[PDB]
Swiss-Prot record, chains A, B, C, D, E, F:
Domain remark text: The N-terminus zinc finger domain is essential for delivering the primed DNA template to the DNA polymerase. The central core domain contains the primase activity. The C-terminus region is responsible for the helicase activity and binds 1 Mg(2+)-dTTP.
Domain (SF4 helicase): residue spans on this chain: 20-287
Binding site for ATP: 51-58
Function in brief: ATP-dependent DNA helicase and primase essential for viral DNA replication and recombination. The helicase moves 5' -> 3' on the lagging strand template, unwinding the DNA duplex ahead of the leading strand polymerase at the replication fork and generating ssDNA for both leading and lagging strand synthesis. ATP or dTTP hydrolysis propels each helicase domain to translocate 2 nt per step sequentially along DNA. Mediates strand transfer when a joint molecule is available and participates in recombinational DNA repair through its role in strand exchange.
EC number(s) stated in the UniProt entry for this protein: 2.7.7.-, 3.6.4.12
dTTP/dATP binding, annotated site positions: 100, 204, 243, 261, 274
UniProt keyword Transmembrane, yes or no: no
Lineage of the organism: Viruses, Duplodnaviria, Heunggongvirae, Uroviricota, Caudoviricetes
Catalytic activity: ATP + H2O = ADP + phosphate + H(+)
Molecular function per GO: 5'-3' DNA helicase activity; ATP binding; ATP hydrolysis activity; DNA helicase activity; DNA-directed RNA polymerase activity; identical protein binding; single-stranded DNA binding; zinc ion binding
GO biological processes: DNA replication, synthesis of primer; viral DNA genome replication
Domain of life: Viruses
Residues represented out of the complete protein: 262 to 549 of 566
Source organism of this protein record: Escherichia phage T7 (Bacteriophage T7)
Named cofactor requirement(s): Mg(2+)
Name of the protein: DNA helicase/primase
């Protein structure tokens, strides 16, 4: 069984690798420190965001989409296989206007009658920056990658967002979807690198059930990452959010970097606080 | 291959969304706050009510049925797998009339001979809203789902109450029922999401026997949930009731949103008090 | 598949229901309050009576049988596994005559010679209200359920007393008898509910060995129960006795209703005192 | 399956039982309280002594042999299947003369040369009171019972001692020796009752391995008794010794009565202290 | 059927006993007290030496071999299953000459060229007392016992040291080696008791991983013994060594007699200190 | 069955033994003291290097390889599973040239253009002392052992570095990978001992979540080790690094020898400091 290369014959591969192996562009918002320990995200790179169920993997990664295609005018590609394009649209809108438009059947009625809908809608999607995959009808790997690709080549996006990488739906009949996740992650790291598009992906965590878990504290280690850690490899960076919803500061969320190929600088990035009012992830002043 | 819609083309689809789109719905009775945190029970959502043995599950749940099928007139399907329809209806009658009919032989005799029974009966069951699965003789999964599907689709029920999801009774010959519970959920959640009905399901908790427990106070945690954390994912809201029956305030019960997908707002909703006289779980005013 | 009845069509079923649908039946003797938090012993239920070793379990249950079988004329079946029929009968006689018949040779000599025995015998067992299970030799589960089953349906006993539910003796070759204590329960509960007889079962306690315990006071909690809490669920009313034989009032025994399905009314029911003369547990007035 | 006797037809059996169902004779030494909670041991009765491995089941029961055949001049029958008649003889001798003749190769040499051996030997076994079974070559049940019987009928002993009731050695080929112990215990309770000989037996405890065990504290409950508790029935009394050899008072031993058919009075008898000097079990002044 | 001997007829057999009957024998080196509590190692007795990983077992044991085979001239059989005979003999040489030969490349070279090696060698191995099983290539139970039996019976060894009883290597195809360990003991203990040889066996401890552990201080308990408590019964003496390698006094080691059949005297024997220079475990003077 | 050699007949075997029987080999670089408590890395041994995530494990092991492979001219095999060959090679180069080659685009651009890369490359890998395992794609146990096996016997490496022993990827269908981490070890240990190569394996830590931990200081104990302590036994020297990146001296890392078969010398070996410029772990002087 040979695949044991010697370090001298690695010469031409180290040269290739050494030329354009990513400097600074696109820096996450909501908390500096993520930036201090990563320096934003690179094209060709694969950002991995994870956390317990219902903790803000979705809220954080959507904020970046927002900021990115607003303040720093970038073409964000959205692919939320678990929600209607109108729903994700909704979050972006309420989010943009610092409000929780879903949690308010009065505010929804409000803006539609009083006309602020058309107002907000244009002011936001006005620059034709945001674009989205559309379905809820189980998407296949190649199928998906194609459209994800169309968002990068056809529409010309800088950043693509794939929410939840477990929803596989491909060539069924081959045991333990532990490889699907693996295979998919490679195609994703492939396409990402060869097009140079910033690719942000969200994956979930296995359920420990061997101690007190995630929704109650417990940091997440590289191991706890769902999917036979093929993604802990192909992904260049890994953001993790932890918060004890049953505690005193359920809105207090710690950001932890589990990997940053680029700066190799890991650990705790800092803290954030959910604003039940704006729905935003504001930077906090904490330390335990 | 095209199906990648653009922000703008969505403006009208998103408008048609933001109205006649109900985010609130069927508010829980017993404590404002279960509402302030969860915005009521959405249709197509799975409500998970849990607690220690004999602590309130059954009663809290039953009270919700009584209000929804009365004051807010909705068809309520009841599948109380551990008691006869006459018993559950007995409680329902007692409950509606703010009296504990079961616990009183005198009151029973009474209302029977003074003709009042028939009154309370019409006055409640009159608008044909209450419907119940009947047997006690162990029900199977597809068998029950079949009947439940009937209520939802056949009778047009809006809410289906299924008390006790540990009573399985299905294809025996496959180790640990841990897979039965999980596959059941996946079917209920599925049933729920596709019919758009409101599904309130009760579950019990694994015996911690590693410290002081549930009927003695002691917060329930998402790990405490009997059934290998499948439901901890498939259900949308987890309502847990905690109380220390062996104390000064046995009837004081704490409400904890163990999870609420739709809002993400978890934590201590509030408190309620058991009224040994009416049998209702009235909202309280307390702080520990 | 219609077996889903609507409330209305149950009118008649519910009338025939509340009338002659006893919810107060067989009150306990020697301590009102047990009767207050439980409204007695309903047929079809499972009454659990536990305590530290040699602290009330036995006597209290033996007294209830004695009262129920006389003054109240019910038929009582005794399943005393750790003793012979003449052993338990000996106790009964003496117990009825407020005399420690066993701990005294002088008296056994007398009554037998002076003829008072035949008197006492006829006076206690005269009304054929007492029947027992006879053997002492390790009884198997199905082997048992069947005899108790006989007592009920064959002999017509309204009450059955199973002393010690740790003496399992069934299908050997299946790890941890923890399973045995659970399966047996499930068979008894079914037995009781279906047959409608009153089942008063005795079980012991887990030796905590983590604090000062049982023999020295210490309240018994539901967790403390032997056999992984299957019974904690299958039984409908758990009565627990506590006392400190190594304290000041070694005769003052506390009576705790650890659980009572029917009423939900839990907590300390009251107190009782041991009278070394009569061998009884006399009614007491106290508050610590 | 019938063996369900009625309490009226039990008349002639209760009469038999009531005549000579044992007052006071032979009271254990080393600690009063055992006596206060049992009143010595009766002829026909079966004393059961148990404790962890190496705690004094053997030292206690040998002290009684001593006292009994010395101060109260009774014919003690000894059957120590795990030690040479000369070894058990040794303990009795050193014991009698308040010394640990085994633990002293100097004291052994001493008395043999200086002539105190013949002295002690006569002064003790002088009254031809002690008698012993002889072998180490595995003894069968009937085989054993016969000799044990010969000690009661042939030699005319008041008290018989059978050390360690696990060493069965009988009709091999019948699964789980759980019955051997059971069967044997019956023959033993039989012969004991029908001859009227005091029978003291020593049995060991199962190994809990579910918490901190025996040699480190932990009282022994009736359950922990090795052998499918057939012996917790046939034996009339059950003495148990507990001591934490890894503690501060490894010589401090608590006596606990797990049963006393006669006085039914159980619990903690009191305490004792090993005298590393005399090897005796002296009464102590303690309370925890 | 007669075999019931009488006290008196025994006088001569008992005399012949009390002399040329050795109760002391082969005292442990390293701390008087292992002796004061156990009176040395009797022949036909099973010595159990245990401790945390790399804490001293091997060394304590090895030192016993060196003294017994030297100063008290006895034939010592060594079966060190985890090291070559040259290694064990290397230590033995180093040890005898109060130097750590292994840990010194200079000293090794030395004694080799200055001819001293040959001296130390004769001076030690000379009286042909040291014998060792040889291989490293996994030994089977009857295979090893066979060889061990050889040393005892063939070579006439008095003491057999068998290091590490977890290295089984026998009839594989029967779940959990827990039965291998137990059946091995039963064979060694048997081998021991019948040949009258002294058997010192080493075992390791189950990983507690439930608190602070063994190499950090933390008393070993009879439950901590790896191998389902078979050895906790079959061996006659259990010598355990405890030390906290991560402290101020890493080399201070505590001696605990976990059990000593022959005497019953258990507890803390004493302390010893590891001398990084001589490599010996010298007796200390300490008190915590 | 003779395979029992006598000490004497081993004279010659023991001479050829102590001579050219290295006990000091391959000392560690950058912190004398590791070398003091371990006398380096003997061939055939298994060196365990662990720590909190991102706290020294990687760098320290990467530095040892770098030194061993140059200044000392040994052959080193790298089995870095979480990185590509050009990735780890990139690190090495930069590491050798005390420059953060990865975290800096400007420099990769330079050296490649200014030709300094070819220089650096030849200077580091010139002597063909470096070889790697190539894949990234989940390697199976037997699949691996074989390649490492190749490096040793085929390529002649004196040292092999296996980064991350949690990336098992072997025979799936056997509960708890706890078994996997143990079996793999056993195969590596065997591999090492038999082949004679130096095996330096990296493994991570159990997240205590019971106190303040790893990322914040806290000493690592042996128990803290991932994979139920099979390694804690199979490995011959465990090196643990501790540090507080959320404290005062985030660069001061402590080096603890958790275990060292060979010498037994355990405890804190010393300290080191992280230099953000060089990316190295410089030798340090300290005492807290």
């Amino acid at each position: 069984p040979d695949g044991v290369v010697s370090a001298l014959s690695l010469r031409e591969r180290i040269r290739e690798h050494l030329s354009s192996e990513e400097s600074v562009g696109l820096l996450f918002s909501g908390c500096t420190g993520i930036n201090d320990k990563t320096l934003g995200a690179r094209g060709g790179e694969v950002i991995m965001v994870t956390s317990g169920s219902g903790m803000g993997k979705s809220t954080f990664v959507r904020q970046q989409a927002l900021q990115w295609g607003t303040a720093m005018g970038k073409k964000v590609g959205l692919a939320m296989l678990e929600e209607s394009v109108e729903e994700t649209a909704e979050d972006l809108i309420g989010l943009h206007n610092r409000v929780r438009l879903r949690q308010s059947d009065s505010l929804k009625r409000e803006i539609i009658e009083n006309g602020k809908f058309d107002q907000w809608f244009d002011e936001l999607f006005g620059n034709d920056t945001f674009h989205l995959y559309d379905s809820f009808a189980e998407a296949e790997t190649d199928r998906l990658l194609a459209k994800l690709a169309y968002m990068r080549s056809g529409l010309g996006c800088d950043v693509i967002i794939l929410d939840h990488i477990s929803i596989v739906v491909s060539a069924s009949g081959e045991s333990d979807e532990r490889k699907m996740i693996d295979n998919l992650m490679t195609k994703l790291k492939g396409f990402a690198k060869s097009t140079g598009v910033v690719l942000v992906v969200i994956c979930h965590l296995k359920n420990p059930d061997k101690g007190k878990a995630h929704e109650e504290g417990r940091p997440v280690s590289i191991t706890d990452l769902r999917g036979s850690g093929a993604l802990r490899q192909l992904s260049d960076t890994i953001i993790a959010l932890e918060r004890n919803q049953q505690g005193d500061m359920p809105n207090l969320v710690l950001v932890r970097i589990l990997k940053c190929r680029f700066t190799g600088d890991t650990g705790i990035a800092g803290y954030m606080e959910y604003n039940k009012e704006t729905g935003w992830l504001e930077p906090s002043s904490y330390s335990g």
